[PDB]
Amino acid sequence: MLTDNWKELAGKAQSTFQKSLKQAIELADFDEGLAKRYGALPSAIGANVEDFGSPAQFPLEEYLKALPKKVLDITEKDPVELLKDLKSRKVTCVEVLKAYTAASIVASKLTNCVQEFLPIEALQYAQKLDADYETKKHLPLYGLPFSIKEMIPFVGRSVTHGSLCYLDRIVDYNADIVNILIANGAYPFVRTTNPQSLMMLECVSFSHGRTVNAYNGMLTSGGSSGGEGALNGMRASPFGLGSDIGGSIRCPAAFNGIYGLRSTLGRIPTADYFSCNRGSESILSVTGPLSRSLDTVNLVMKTVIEAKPWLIDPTLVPLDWKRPENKKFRVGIYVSDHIVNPSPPINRALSMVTEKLKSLGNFEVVTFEPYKPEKVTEILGKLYFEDGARDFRATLQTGEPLLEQTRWAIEGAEDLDMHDQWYWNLQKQAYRKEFLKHWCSYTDNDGNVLDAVIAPVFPNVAAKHETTKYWTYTSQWNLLDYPVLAFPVTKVDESLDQPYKNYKPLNDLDKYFYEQYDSPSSFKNAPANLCLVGLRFTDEKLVEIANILRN
Amino acid sequence: MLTDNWKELAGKAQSTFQKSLKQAIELADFDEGLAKRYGALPSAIGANVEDFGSPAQFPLEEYLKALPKKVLDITEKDPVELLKDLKSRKVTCVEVLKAYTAASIVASKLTNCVQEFLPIEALQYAQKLDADYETKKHLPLYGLPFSIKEMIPFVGRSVTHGSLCYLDRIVDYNADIVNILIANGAYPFVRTTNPQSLMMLECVSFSHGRTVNAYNGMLTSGGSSGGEGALNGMRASPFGLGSDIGGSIRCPAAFNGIYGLRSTLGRIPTADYFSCNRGSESILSVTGPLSRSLDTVNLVMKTVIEAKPWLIDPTLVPLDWKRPENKKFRVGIYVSDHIVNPSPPINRALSMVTEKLKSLGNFEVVTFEPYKPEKVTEILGKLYFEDGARDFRATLQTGEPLLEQTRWAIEGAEDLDMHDQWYWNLQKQAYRKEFLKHWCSYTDNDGNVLDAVIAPVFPNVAAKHETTKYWTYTSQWNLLDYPVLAFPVTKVDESLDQPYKNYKPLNDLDKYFYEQYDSPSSFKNAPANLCLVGLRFTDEKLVEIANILRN
Lengths: 551, 551
Fold this sequence. Notes:
Oligomer: part of a larger assembly
Largest sheet of chain A: 11 strands, mixed
Largest interface: A-B, 10 and 8 residues
Helix content of chain A: 25-40%
Structural class of chain A: alpha/beta
């Protein structure tokens, strides 16, 4: 690592971004009308990484007004549909790159979701893909650009996960999943922001400033894949890759009203990502796609898994990506863990999705009760930072300040002795086994297991900054390693989502979240998403049920 | 102005307040004990600007219990005495700022009297005042913080007078009176609340909610300088600057049992304040200080006038602030205007003050009769809103609701033709001339004019919400532009202040105010104040007579 003063390093980070932003504008080739509107947009980028600017109230509305038909006709197109145009040559690989580059630039200024553009290598990828049209026409993602979280290695770049001390950590390789996607006709064109330590459900770092929600600029984008949620919520990327060890894929997707899949560990390669606590295996992160488009989520998983990634990454299981043949479904609704109750907008989403499933004949819908959700915090309290956060704190030798959200994640971290880790590994495996028995207790008399559970992603829609003080609605499924797909349902409705009256809080933490929901106007136009949870390796059931819920 | 929906804007206003509240708490640096008691105080701030919370029964009692010795030893000290401590350096400017900031926070939660704290610039002010101690110790207000009504421009801030549509009206300058006070060693540290339209003797707006009385949380703070009256009634500010066009300095001062000077127009600069009807000159507002200290009111007046403000504001008169040379006094008592009789607490305040002046040999005391007080309503009914309230109603284009109190002030407003204004300007000047003839009819055989008149500020102590339906006891002296000093006398006494028996009302409006005074318990602990009225530019006589009335 580095030991220079952090203010100098933040400058170096800003320079890298500004250097890539300059090259991107050249690639995008604005006409004067757009250059004018772009110049006049409210920015979530400040003068320094501690200055958070003055973001728009509805960044997405500003985005749709600012960008021309020449761009939106491509970036607003569903990526699976756009792949048809790229295949039939109604649109060029370079043409698509130019539009999405322009979109990401406008998205970058409005939400601060881009850490580094990749226009040099992206133009080379897109140019040769056009030249090779006849031989690569058949590839399943031919011509499609995509975004990658900054923690994902890309050739010749620093990989820092937001820590300034790692700005000299250059890799000469791509992540396995990136090379696989390139082998299938795609290419990365932008690197998205990630926060300090990665262990916050928001997106603040001293490498980029603060990332904000795509639908309401006063709220967080979520985290840790906050850039990914914002960029793909603005539909300025066809899809992106994030990571999820505590909700870091599903929380951004839910806050920005798009799809995000925490895929089951052992399906797609993620270990070559960079994070804190490298070599820690007690609790493992997973990767997975975020996209505006469910069909795009499904196609990336299918494309990656059909490339047989277990022949490059031996931690992976050779299990085909297969659409389920189920005609009937048994589904549970997780109304609350009875520790922190959901805010009205989430509560209405649960009823909406419940009533829709009941209206289809082939769904049996039951209430799903929690199982010792307090044990999630206790076990993850010992295993997230099992070295007592020594590795993370060493990143602060530059003088880099400790963010308030990071404080929550590392407070109480013990430096575990080997026997302490063994104790909590046994606690971890026992809880997983107990929870499976809980899930199977919902099997019916004929032996039909629960296919999926519908649950909140968070006790609320996109949070106000520095208030993501409860993780269980996402970290529960990291402790269990269950596949979870966040999906859209509705938006805040000011008539329907007034605060609960005569509410009696369940505890101090529940009271905090109740008071956080002061009125729906504080979360105007914020998406209310939910998630589908399945047993391990049932990812595809979740996609199929999400398909039905959106038709 | 703005045209966004008003609920979004109320959000931005609350956000501005809440972000500055966060910064104020860090400046004050609560210890664990104060943070605990503060957190558990009953709040007059709601979840939204239409939810008024549940204020304490006696906010001042809770304020004195909640704050530590380290703060109260400063904020309860008379500011003129505190200036000696600041001059001799027994206390630092930063120490005084920290204490009063802490006091204003507790006062803000208990009464809802703060619109925006100013801790960033105040810390800069206090720090450089400490650094410049040797060169600036000689200044007359060295080290003293003060509060300013939100309508008073301060650098870098929006100036809205409570209207949500003006939240983007940012100023790059201070008001003249602020700069003059800074030149003499003072600095502003908090901006206080003001109501919709500014034309109510209460303090309700869609920028802040509802402001309540410092002595009884069920009653109004008064208005329009309601924030100043509550904050200074809690002695959480050394003094404040308000405005007075219809009673808006004396009504807050009287309701909260402190001093408030409506200075003669043309002595102290006020024109650069913001209100509705900018450019209207038929009836002009004035400014002046509010404080718990009579000596502090006098020193502020003396300080600003000795700065020769007519060399910055050419509407002002070069008339020195001079203590009067009087040995005898001739004083009139205004028991009633015979349209609305005062309630028992006010009538007892009049008796107390009469007997005290009569017991001193050098005061001649006579009864003072009204002169066509009905004409006040008639003339001000045409000149307060001479454009037919078009300028104010244009503020409600955001959908911001019209408050009941604002409704009273704008009902019946005509859009005057130039000739109509000429007609009513003549009525105004004739009434002023006639009234002077009335006042001089009290001159004695030797030619000694009446030096001052003692009158109610309102037909009662601090009113119940939405009942301030009679203005003449203050607006009479705005039509005439006479200086008036509100001053404390007594408090409600439940034995002495029972409702009048066998009362016969004078008219429907008198009946309404009689029924409002249901029992002294409805106004428990409410200060009963009066005011001193003088001829134009005799402000100092009013200060000197108040000095005697307090011993």
